Design a protein around this ligand. Structure first.
Ligand code: ATP
Ligand code: A9W
Length: 327
């Protein structure tokens, strides 16, 4: 069967913290008063919730209310416990309160409001310097949650709030986040298609924090190369083929060989044979202002098949790509 895997970092965090820290099922929610909040406008409606701009009428401050759609009780307590454990961490969204919505009869998560700059505007206008600056802010959030025994599992632009005016970044939507327990087999149906790590695409369930680093690499590649999304799969199978056309099939076969994974037989007909492409191949006159040897070397170290061989968030912060960033 598949060979087991453990993270190379923060393996023992949930072991040396008390059971109350990670045992989200046993957590007793301290309910706030829904009357403290007045809904202003609907901001969005996702697959798991309806999001509203609101006012905390006790201090007249702008807040965001995430009214959870009815889903398994376990999923809701896990998000709450993770948000509470991470509260106050660098660039982590602050959960201000938890109330019972009077209409839905479900929990409503109250968060600090972030004046998020338009995604299009950020994608099209962030400079080489700003990309490095914001990547460093994301790494602060990832190293914090990983050091706290949590993996996000849904790192992507939609889950990163940027208030560009105040150079403020927040990592949001901890709805897919999980506690990392060495040897635990996790559901591979996490992250959005273009951000899925090769471990998820090959159905390797013993993954860890390093999945977030692959997702981060996907975000970076699209941004610096002006190729949205960087790995543009038509489905989860073609998603692996898109990766293989850049990283090559030989290192993919080495990866599956090392972990004793058996590829789904449907790959035999679609994967073909591909050599690794040098990162300089993706450079052209419309993206050369966002690329540098440091950017390419950094990307190279995140987008690796072997989840164990990727830079951790802390090593990533030491990379020459960030030397120019004012600290
Ligand atoms: N703290 C916040 N400040 C400002 N806007 C927010 C905040 N939190 C969430 N939003 C807005 O709500 C959107 C969705 O939030 P979230 O992803 O947590 O809900 P979801 O159920 O996953 O919805 P979706 O399916 O759209 O992702 C975000 O993309 C963002 O635009
Ligand atoms: C530094 C960096 C790199 C790649 C990205 O897509 C982003 C980014 C993050 C969040 C949003 C807004 N939701 C937009 C962008 Cl471009 C940032």
């Amino acid at each position: 069967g598949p060979v087991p895997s453990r993270a190379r970092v923060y393996t023992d965090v949930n072991t040396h913290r008390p059971s109350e820290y990670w045992d989200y099922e046993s957590h007793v929610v301290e309910w706030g008063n829904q009357d403290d909040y007045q809904l202003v406008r609907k901001l969005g409606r996702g697959k798991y919730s309806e999001v509203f701009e609101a006012i905390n009428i006790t201090n007249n401050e702008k807040v965001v209310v995430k009214i959870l759609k009815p889903v398994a009780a376990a999923k809701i307590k896990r998000e709450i416990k993770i948000l509470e454990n991470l509260r106050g961490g660098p660039n982590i969204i602050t959960l201000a309160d938890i109330v019972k919505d009077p209409v839905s009869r479900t929990p409503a998560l109250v968060f600090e409001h972030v004046n998020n700059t338009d995604f299009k505007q950020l994608y099209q206008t962030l400079t080489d310097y700003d990309i490095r600056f914001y990547m460093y802010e994301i790494l602060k959030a990832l190293d914090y949650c990983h050091s706290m025994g949590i993996m996000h599992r849904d790192v992507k632009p939609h889950n990163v709030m940027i208030d560009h005016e105040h150079r403020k970044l927040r990592l949001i939507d901890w709805g897919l986040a999980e506690f990392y327990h060495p040897g635990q087999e996790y559901n591979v149906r996490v992250a959005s298609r273009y951000f899925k790590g090769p471990e998820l695409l090959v159905d390797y369930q013993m993954y860890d924090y390093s999945l977030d680093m692959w997702s981060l690499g996907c975000m970076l590649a699209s941004m610096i190369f002006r190729k949205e999304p960087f790995f543009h799969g038509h489905d989860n199978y073609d998603q692996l083929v898109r990766i293989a056309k850049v990283l090559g099939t030989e290192d993919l076969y080495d990866y599956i060989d090392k972990y004793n994974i058996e590829l789904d037989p449907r790959f035999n007909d679609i994967l073909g044979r591909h050599s690794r492409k040098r990162w300089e191949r993706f450079v052209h006159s419309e993206n050369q202002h966002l690329v540098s040897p440091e950017a390419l070397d950094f990307l190279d170290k995140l987008l690796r098949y072997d989840h164990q061989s990727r830079l951790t968030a802390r090593e990533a912060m030491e990379h020459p790509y960030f030397y120019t960033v004012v600290k």
